[PDB]
Design a protein around this nucleic acid. Structure first.
Ligand SMILES: O=P(O)(O)O[C@H]1[C@H](OP(=O)(O)O)[C@H](OP(=O)(O)O)[C@H](OP(=O)(O)O)[C@@H](OP(=O)(O)O)[C@H]1OP(=O)(O)O
Lengths: 496, 359, 564
DNA sequence: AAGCAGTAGAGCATGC
DNA sequence: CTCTACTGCTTCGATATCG
DNA sequence: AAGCAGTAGAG
DNA sequence: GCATGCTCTACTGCTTCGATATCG
């Protein structure tokens, strides 16, 4: 659905064989799984903090589940990520965290994979919210568990069928296992070629820390043709200028919110003043125009909300430098009117022939003055692994008014000699790269995320995000090898 | 529900219940908790209304506590604001002595919100807040009357909002705004009266259309508002009949038009008969000979309906109270009773006494 | 910085008599002049506006010697326009039954600049003339009017009722002139103003003669009156060493209302008696007031609010280290798609206004990017407090100017994935070939760009980037309407607002056939309700008892219908 | 100011 | 008297606030 | 915060 | 003029976004 959260259970095989790693200048698989789980917590605490996470330890002596089963320790329930839930997981880090872990958890115990999948199913059952995906990440290094037995093996395959009936899909994060990881002994039929470490733990250690919003529609309008031919659209947005979250005023001695209340009162008698006994004014030198709070919202209303089509236009008149507002994306909604998708698709694949674009008056909300907007059609681009990059529909391009443009002063046209143009073409060909779409990253926002992480987890000092929007002065210099001095000598006079 | 079950036996515990209600309103966040706190508070003030506990309820402090909320109304949602306006009016109904020097502020707040909710071409009206303001204004107009002789501006504004509230809208569900308008009209039609004479045809047609509705509660409220309308209009005509003859003629010809018709359906016939007997004072001052023809043909009608035409065994006896009240009203303005119809009248009222447990 | 306008208005005899099927031309002059002056009064400008009429039955000008310079009353002088002129344009302007000279209106307006502005220091000097070209002029000041204003640097703009080339609503980009909307004296005066303007300037005075309709939907009345936007100076640095000194000007920026709506109180009408406070309570039982120094700001981190003070906020934060317009690379065109443009503004980056070397360097860069079909990627920061950002600087070669146009580009955080269902690979949404033919007919019937009789020129009907914002042309008229008649409610919208916001009739009335075709071809069933109904539509609905065969004989004897 | 999931009770049909 | 500061003020981006 | 342009300290 | 469910409408909570007022 839409309000459905994403749930995830981290299942770590803290039994016996992740605590004596064979290199000692490398990192034990228990520490690898703990660093991975902690990076997912730090990523999801500001990426999508409405999701639910849990970590369960099996192969451990002491137990803390609800059924009081043998050798299953549930460290945390399914709940939203927090600072204390990362500080509790901090204790089992490094070569010392093993020793901190042994004295209060357990180790090397017998277990049953059926009962650990049972405890994970009970964790998913006890959730009162609605869940979109339910997943179990299995951190294990031994393939073929319960190798001495087959009743345990068949019961485990049965309880995995029980899990996959209800919609829970587990995946294994296999660890090293010197001697390969044979994925076919036990873990090809339980889950939805010898190996080394993985291809998922390493890019799961890459903390992304970028907020992700679900697909809401932002407007559900009716696209009218004259007064009669109305079809229903939704006006989505695909670029939106991520902001930092706003601060919350706290009480300094308690660190609790403080419930701001603003009131208007007159300084004559100090009496509480309602919204009915004020007006709105503007003073122009000596005249005072006095409207009301209702009448100031009447000045703006022109049309009804929706899109009024006003003909069609070739794209050659839609100038690229005519930009004032980030574009939106329209898409037919075939539930407020029937056949909306058919009329949209006919209009789409018929404006896709020529370079024509629908022109509209866009009224998003009620008492909002109209804007002229250009519905440029677009096809879809996809691949054979069904990754689509452009969805089909129109791109709603806002066009400026006469007073949104501004004029420039007079500037002389001082053209260049073709020697200068040809020696600047070499300069621009030397520095060429590929702009993907999402190679760059907001440094102010990233540093805010880093500072908040380091102040809530009270680590040692704020990590600095390595800047990326900055230019590389030495690399650009050595790329442009000994060229810019002769270019500025050839185009610039020998002075200054 | 426990305060409904046990009534004034809650009296040693009521002040702590009031402090708990006020605390839950000011500290809890959900509308689902602020609404029953105000429901319990309103029911508490209605229960321990006439008592000595109304000094222990600091009613004047409760007015400041809930009048500050209208100023910091920073989305108090809708159905909390309904209860807040109803509570503010009920503070003027019960214990009005600690509410004398802030009744005018409260009238200003009620009329400002009613104006914002009905006279706004910017947005859809919030019907909970409309029902709440009309409830609170109907409670404040007890003990703080705003009549058409003392100050006619406030009474004309209140009548205009009531007349907008009770107007029929085709394709209407949610009959809380028309019910609150009709109940304020049924209680206080006496207070706006000069506003009531000149809008008389429209008010009669609206109140007569609302009485044939499907809802029990809206129809009951409309019947009460209609009898209050007819009572006030006849009392206004009976003081000055040298310029209200046309109104008297319209009302009499309307009552006769309902009476002659066989589309009675017993509610319309009962209100025709009741108003027909109600307009007898004005007929006594306008003709002096007409209240004698009334009660002759009204007794002939009572006789033919349920006395000797033995048409019993049907839905015939369920308008006998209305006929009896009408004869009782016409008989007051009649000097020199004929004495030919007196045994018929006596037999009619003892037949009413006989047919008492059938109701 | 300032200017000065003097406004010649036609109050002639034939100026206000003809109302055949259109609006009266003198009142159209009133509409355009009220659109000109209400913007200048409501924008709080420092400009001089003098009203001068011609065709008037009085006269008072500096040199009215003889029959020349007659029938002309300068109504006010170079002075800041108050609301008096605003109300006098509709009240104390009456039409005239008097045909006066029109070329002499220019030469009487050519005195006020050298008389009233005798010691003040101006920058722009403009004469606006609303004429009719219908009176026998005086062709004696021919080279006088032409050498004089070129000697003392005066700008001029003319206005006919009809420019050079579906009922006349007021002009909705349709018929700018009717079947007979010109007299022979109009033709003679039109010819003399065309030749006097081309002989005045050369090739560019022809673009300053606008009809009333087309100027009512355009900003030509402020074209030679708007000021110059300020410069952003920096240095375009392509490497650590190369530095091109640049100036950037905001090309497109969405202009919004600058004057607020001050909250005054009712029944006193003063902003000063009322004062708001924003106290901070606590969430205890009786909410205790706390001061503004017991409050620290805090941020949400998961399921808890962590304290983050403001001095620590300024200490640990990003540091922009000043303004910059560096270059990160030059990718190419068509990697930067148009749908990823991000900011609120458009920058146009020129060189220095004074540097021949920086101009030839910037021109070589622009021409290199134009030749390679490549664009640039920059890191623009405004100053030390602005956030840094990336964007695209693409070439914009012209024949009149040349510059780099910079539009901001998204970050990774600013992108939404949002998969959508396919429409060309759908099954039950594939249109029929007849329905495809029908929408092809509708598209071809509703074009708005018609190639004239020329080679490849595509001048388009209904251009929606030249129309002014209707928001201000409603706000100014309602502010006028309550500064002049302060009791009546808000008026309806003006008709020319809808006329400039609608498409013309030659595309409206043509396409009635395919609209009526697809109305029957595509079945559309809507199943909703209750959309946009206000409280002013819900709760406004108005908009002797003894007499209560021979009776039939009465009915026959007095008055009745058909018998029997 | 609007989308979007979730619910509670208002208003009404129905009962032979 | 002929050259550099103070105020103005004008702007603009980021921030907070509200429907 | 940031900057250019009218009027006042400088021997 | 009563009793019992059933449908579905209208409201709330949460969350995003955009317009407006304000501050370094
Ligand atoms: O002749 P138009 O179709 O009305 O447009 C022209 C011109 O178009 P061309 O490039 O074909 O000559 C410019 O259009 P853009 O550069 O905006 O795309 C425009 O420039 P500005 O709007 O930036 O001012 C302006 O020409 P100019 O710059 O000389 O004013 C304008 O002519 P108008 O000013 O008469 O509208």
């Amino acid at each position: 659905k839409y309000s459905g959260r994403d749930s995830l259970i981290f299942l770590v095989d803290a039994s016996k064989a992740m605590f004596e790693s064979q290199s000692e200048d490398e990192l034990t698989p228990f520490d690898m799984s703990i660093q991975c789980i902690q990076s997912v917590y730090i990523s999801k605490i500001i990426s999508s903090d409405r999701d639910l996470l849990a970590v369960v330890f099996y192969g451990t002596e002491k137990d803390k589940n609800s059924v009081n089963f043998k050798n299953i320790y549930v460290l945390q329930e399914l709940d939203n990520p927090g600072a204390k839930r990362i500080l509790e997981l901090d204790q089992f880090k490094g070569q010392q965290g093993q020793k901190r872990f042994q004295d209060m958890m357990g180790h090397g115990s017998d277990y049953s994979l059926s009962e650990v999948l049972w405890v994970c199913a009970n964790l998913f059952s006890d959730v009162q919210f609605k869940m979109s995906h339910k997943r179990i990440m299995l951190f294990t290094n031994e393939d073929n568990p319960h190798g001495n037995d087959s009743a345990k093996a068949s019961r485990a395959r049965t309880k995995a069928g029980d899990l996959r009936d209800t919609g829970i899909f587990l995946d294994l994060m296999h660890l090293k296992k010197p001697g390969g990881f044979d994925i076919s002994l036990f873990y090809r039929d339980i889950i939805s070629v010898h190996f080394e470490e993985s291809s998922k733990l390493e890019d799961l250690l890459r903390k992304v820390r970028a907020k992700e919003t679900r697909k809401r529609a932002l407007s559900r309008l009716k696209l009218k043709l004259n007064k009669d031919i109305v079809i229903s659209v939704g006006i989505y947005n695909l670029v939106q200028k991520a902001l930092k979250p706003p601060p919350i005023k706290l009480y300094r001695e308690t660190n609790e919110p403080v419930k701001t209340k603003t009131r208007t009162f007159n300084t004559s008698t100090g009496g509480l003043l309602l919204p009915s006994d004020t007006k709105r004014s503007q003073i122009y030198g000596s005249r005072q125009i006095i409207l009301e709070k209702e009448e100031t919202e009447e000045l703006k209303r022109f049309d009804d909300p929706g899109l009024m089509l006003m003909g069609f236009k070739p794209l050659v008149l839609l100038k690229k430098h005519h930009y004032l507002r980030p574009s939106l994306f329209v898409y037919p909604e075939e539930s407020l009117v029937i056949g909306s998708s058919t009329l949209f698709s006919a209009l789409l694949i018929k404006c896709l022939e020529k370079e024509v674009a629908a022109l509209c008056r866009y009224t998003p909300r009620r008492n909002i003055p109209p804007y002229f907007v250009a519905l440029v059609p677009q096809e879809e681009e996809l691949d054979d692994q069904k990754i689509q990059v452009t969805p089909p529909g129109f791109q709603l391009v806002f066009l400026p008014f006469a007073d949104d443009k501004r004029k420039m002063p007079f500037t002389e046209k001082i053209m260049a000699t073709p020697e200068q143009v040809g020696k600047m073409k070499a300069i621009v060909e030397k520095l060429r790269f590929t702009y993907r779409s999402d190679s760059f990253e907001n440094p102010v926002l990233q540093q805010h995320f880093r500072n908040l992480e380091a102040l809530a987890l009270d680590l040692m000092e704020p990590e600095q995000a390595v800047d990326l929007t900055l230019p590389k002065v030495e690399a650009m210099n050595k790329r442009l090898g000994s060229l810019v001095d002769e270019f500025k000598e050839l185009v610039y006079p020998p002075d200054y | 529900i426990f305060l409904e079950k046990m009534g004034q036996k809650i009296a040693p515990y009521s002040v702590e219940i009031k402090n708990t209600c006020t605390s839950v309103y000011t500290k809890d966040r959900a509308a689902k908790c602020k609404i029953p706190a105000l429901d319990l508070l309103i029911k508490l003030l209605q229960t321990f209304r006439s008592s000595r506990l109304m000094d222990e309820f600091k009613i004047g402090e409760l007015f400041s506590k809930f009048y500050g909320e209208l100023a910091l109304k920073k989305k108090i949602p809708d159905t909390v604001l309904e209860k807040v306006y109803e509570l503010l009016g009920l503070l003027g109904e019960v214990h009005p002595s600690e509410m004398i020097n802030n009744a005018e502020n409260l009238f200003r707040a009620f009329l400002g919100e009613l104006k914002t909710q009905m006279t706004s071409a910017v947005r859809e009206p919030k019907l909970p807040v409309l029902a709440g303001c009309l409830k609170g204004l109907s409670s404040l107009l007890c003990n703080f009357t705003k009549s058409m002789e003392e100050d006619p501006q406030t009474s004309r504004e209140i009548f205009n909002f009531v007349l907008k509230a009770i107007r029929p809208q085709i394709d209407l569900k949610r009959y809380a705004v028309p019910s609150a308008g009709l109940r304020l009209f049924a209680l206080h039609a006496s207070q706006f009266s000069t506003c009531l004479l000149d809008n008389y045809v429209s008010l009669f047609e609206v109140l007569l259309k609302w009485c044939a509705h499907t809802n029990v509660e809206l129809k009951k409220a409309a019947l009460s508002a209609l009898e209050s309308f007819l009572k006030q209009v006849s009392n206004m005509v009976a003081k000055n009949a040298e310029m209200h003859k046309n109104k008297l003629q319209y009302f009499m010809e309307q009552f006769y038009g309902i009476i002659r018709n066989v589309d009675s359906n017993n509610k319309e016939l009962s209100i025709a008969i009741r108003g027909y007997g109600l307009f007898a004072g004005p007929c006594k001052v306008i003709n002096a000979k007409d209240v004698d023809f009334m009660y002759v043909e009204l007794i002939q009608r009572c006789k033919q309906m349920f006395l000797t035409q033995t048409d019993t065994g049907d839905d015939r006896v369920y308008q006998m109270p209305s006929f009896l009240q009408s004869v009782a009203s016409v008989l007051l303005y009649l000097d020199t009773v004929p004495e030919v119809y007196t045994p018929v009248l006596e037999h009619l009222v003892v037949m009413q006494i006989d047919s008492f447990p059938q109701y | 910085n300032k200017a000065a306008v003097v406004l010649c208005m036609d109050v002639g005899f034939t100026m206000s008599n003809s109302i055949p099927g259109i609006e009266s031309p003198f009142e159209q002059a009133k509409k355009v002049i009220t659109m000109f002056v209400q913007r200048q009064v409501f924008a709080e400008n420092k400009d001089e506006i003098a009203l001068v009429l011609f065709g008037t039955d009085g006269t008072d000008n500096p040199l009215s010697g003889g029959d020349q310079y007659q029938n002309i009353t300068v109504h006010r002088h170079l002075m800041l326009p108050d609301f008096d002129l605003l109300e006098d344009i509709e009240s104390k302007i009456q039409p005239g039954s008097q045909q006066a000279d029109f070329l002499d209106a220019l030469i009487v307006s050519m005195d006020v600049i050298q008389h009233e502005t005798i010691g003040k220091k101006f920058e722009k000097r403009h004469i606006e003339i609303f004429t009719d070209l219908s009176s026998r002029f005086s062709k004696s000041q021919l080279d006088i009017i032409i050498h004089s204003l070129k000697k003392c640097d005066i700008s001029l703009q003319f206005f006919l009722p009809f420019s050079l080339g579906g009922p006349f609503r007021l002009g909705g980009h349709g018929p700018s002139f009717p079947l007979k909307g010109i007299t022979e004296q109009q033709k003679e005066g039109l010819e003399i103003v065309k030749m006097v303007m081309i002989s005045l300037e050369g090739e560019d005075g022809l673009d300053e003669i606008y009809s009333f309709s087309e100027s009512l939907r355009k900003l030509c009345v402020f074209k030679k009156i708007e000021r110059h936007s300020i410069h952003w100076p920096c240095r375009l640095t392509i490497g650590s060493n190369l530095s091109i000194r640049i100036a950037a000007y905001k090309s497109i920026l969405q202009e919004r209302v600058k004057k607020t709506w001050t909250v005054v109180d009712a029944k006193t009408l003063k902003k000063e008696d009322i004062q708001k406070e924003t106290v901070y309570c606590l969430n205890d039982d009786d909410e205790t007031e706390v001061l503004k120094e017991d409050i620290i700001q805090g941020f949400r981190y998961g399921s808890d609010i962590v304290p983050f003070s403001k001095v620590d906020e300024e200490q640990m934060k990003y540091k922009s280290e000043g303004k910059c317009f560096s270059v990160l690379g030059f990718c190419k065109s068509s990697q930067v798609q148009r749908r990823f443009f991000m900011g609120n503004q458009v920058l146009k980056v020129f060189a220095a206004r004074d540097d021949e070397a920086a101009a030839v360097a910037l021109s070589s860069l622009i021409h290199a990017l134009d030749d390679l079909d490549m664009v640039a990627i920059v890191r623009y920061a405004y100053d030390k407090r602005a956030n840094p950002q990336v964007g695209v600087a693409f070439p914009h070669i012209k024949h009149n100017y040349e510059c780099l146009v910079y539009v901001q580009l998204p970050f990774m955080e600013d992108l939404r994935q949002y998969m959508f269902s396919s429409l060309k690979n759908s099954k039950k949404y594939a249109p029929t070939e007849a329905q495809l033919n029908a929408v092809d007919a509708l598209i071809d019937s509703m074009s708005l760009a018609k190639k004239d009789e020329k080679t490849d020129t595509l001048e388009d009907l209904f251009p929606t980037t030249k129309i002014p914002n209707p928001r201000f042309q409603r706000l100014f008229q309602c502010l006028l309407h309550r500064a002049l008649h302060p009791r009546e409610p808000l008026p309806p919208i003006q008709q020319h607002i809808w006329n400039m916001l609608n498409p013309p009739a030659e595309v409206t009335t043509k396409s009635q056939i395919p609209l009526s075709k697809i109305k029957t071809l595509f079945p559309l069933i809507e199943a909703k309700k209750k959309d946009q109904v206000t409280a002013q539509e819900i709760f406004q609905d108005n908009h002797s008892v003894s007499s209560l065969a021979e009776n039939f004989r009465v009915l026959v004897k007095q008055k009745k219908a058909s018998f029997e």
